[PDB]
């Protein structure tokens, strides 16, 4: 979830953390990718530029 | 030069790796593992996943080198012919981003590596001879396309009726005995083509019926039964002596 105040006395531990991996979120260069993939679902006239809002 | 890139590989993975923060020439090494090790015939998709890592590391790069940083992987999409990342590479912006004329060549490279008609291919063989200039190995890139197009033609011609004269099924290639007999016998040896050719009367005849588990499963389980009875032969030879 969003809030992280629930554990690590037992999830992420010395020994228990063998593939228990902390997962943050993605950097810049990712909004471009989402803009590339989800706007490829629509039809995209042939020229309305897209880096102008990243 | 692949042994020079091999001594440079064995120097790269510890000497360039002995230079801190290289996210720059490691993608160069990815292109190198996609041209040397695909020139070592490893796999289309392992080397092309290294081309995927290269394709997502070819940004913020100057224009007369990013105009030719896609030539290897897209003339390898000409090599691939199971292109499998049209929807990600060439719909993607790196083939739809740059000002020069080589990306305008890679546009029609992309669309021809989507369609692949003989009416486009054998006619733009002369239109892509200056695009055969940038072919690093002059065999496999076009040879997978046309040596796939062999059996493409064959399933276009042999399919609708099984047995046939060899001469009129070979009229669409005009050679009767040179390599199409070897290709059809090779598809017999690869089980793409189930039948019998001819040289005497020149009559190809397609037919097949392999699986009989009534014979196979029964008799091979009896072979296992006989092995088990031989395993009981020592209970026998033990109760006797």
């Amino acid at each position: 979830t969003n809030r992280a105040d629930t554990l690590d006395p037992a999830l992420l531990r010395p020994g228990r953390l063998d593939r228990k991996i902390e997962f943050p979120l993605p950097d810049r260069r990712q909004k471009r990718l989402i803009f590339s993939t989800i706007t490829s679902k629509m039809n995209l006239s042939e020229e309305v530029d897209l880096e102008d809002y990243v | 030069n692949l042994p020079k890139a091999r001594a440079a590989l064995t120097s790269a993975r510890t000497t360039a790796n002995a230079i801190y923060c290289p996210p720059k020439l490691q993608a160069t090494l990815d292109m190198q593992s996609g041209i040397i090790h695909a020139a070592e015939e490893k796999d289309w998709k392992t080397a092309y996943s290294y081309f995927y890592e290269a394709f997502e590391g070819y940004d913020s790069i100057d224009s007369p080198k990013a105009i030719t940083s896609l030539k290897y992987m897209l003339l390898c999409k000409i090599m691939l012919n199971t292109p499998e990342d049209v929807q990600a590479l060439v719909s993607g912006k790196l083939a739809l981003r740059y000002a020069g004329r080589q990306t305008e060549a890679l546009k029609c490279v992309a669309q021809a590596s989507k369609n692949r008609s003989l009416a486009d291919f054998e006619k733009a063989l002369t239109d892509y001879r200056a695009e055969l200039r940038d072919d690093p190995i002059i065999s496999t890139h076009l040879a997978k396309l046309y040596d796939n197009l062999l059996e493409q033609n064959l399933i276009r011609v042999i399919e609708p009726f099984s047995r046939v004269q060899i001469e009129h099924i070979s009229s669409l290639i005009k050679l009767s005995k040179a390599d199409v007999e070897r290709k059809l016998s090779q598809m017999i040896l690869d089980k793409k083509f189930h039948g019998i050719l001819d040289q005497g009367e020149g009559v190809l005849i397609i037919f097949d019926e392999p699986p009989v588990d009534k014979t196979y499963e029964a008799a091979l389980e009896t072979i296992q039964n006989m092995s088990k009875v031989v395993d009981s032969l020592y209970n026998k030879a033990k109760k006797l002596t």
């Binding site: - | 399919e159 609708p160 009726f161 099984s162 047995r163 046939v164 004269q165 009129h168 009367e201 009559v203 005849i205």
Partner: protein
């Protein structure tokens, strides 16, 4: 038209020329002839689509007597040549509507079914059809027997 739709009754194609071409020799409505065969690069394609009818639909009426025919007899029955036969064999085998297999070791070939593809089906069809007929037999031979021996 409709008599040509049921078994197609292997007529003369110049009697089709009679029927479908003396419609222009009508001292009445020629707007049927004008709409259908007054066309040239569509109506000529309808004339040869009706040659496609004679080959198409008459292979579907001749599909019974095969598993044995040469090629000359198929030319002598399709009301056309052997070259027109091979062109029509080409476009109807790429139709691949019913499974053809044609070969010229001597030419005894045909449009065909999948060529009796089974084993014991013959025992099933022949002996079980005929013998379950022969077991329904006694069950209605007693029927006939009782109904005729009510009186005599």
């Amino acid at each position: 038209l409709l008599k040509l739709f049921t078994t197609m009754e292997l007529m003369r194609w110049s009697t089709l020329v009679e029927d479908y071409g003396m419609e222009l020799r009508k001292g009445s409505l020629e707007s049927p002839a004008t709409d259908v065969f007054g066309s040239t690069e569509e109506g000529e394609k309808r004339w040869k689509d009706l040659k496609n009818r004679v080959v198409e639909h008459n292979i579907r009426i001749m599909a019974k007597y095969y598993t044995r025919i040469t090629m000359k007899r198929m030319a002598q029955l399709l009301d056309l040549s052997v070259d027109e036969s091979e062109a029509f064999l080409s476009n109807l085998v790429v139709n691949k509507t019913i499974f053809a297999k044609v070969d010229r070791l001597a030419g005894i070939i045909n449009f065909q079914r999948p060529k009796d593809p089974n084993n014991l089906l013959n025992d099933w069809s022949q002996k079980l059809n005929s013998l379950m007929s022969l077991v329904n037999k006694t069950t209605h031979l007693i029927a006939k027997e009782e109904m005729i021996h009510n009186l005599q």
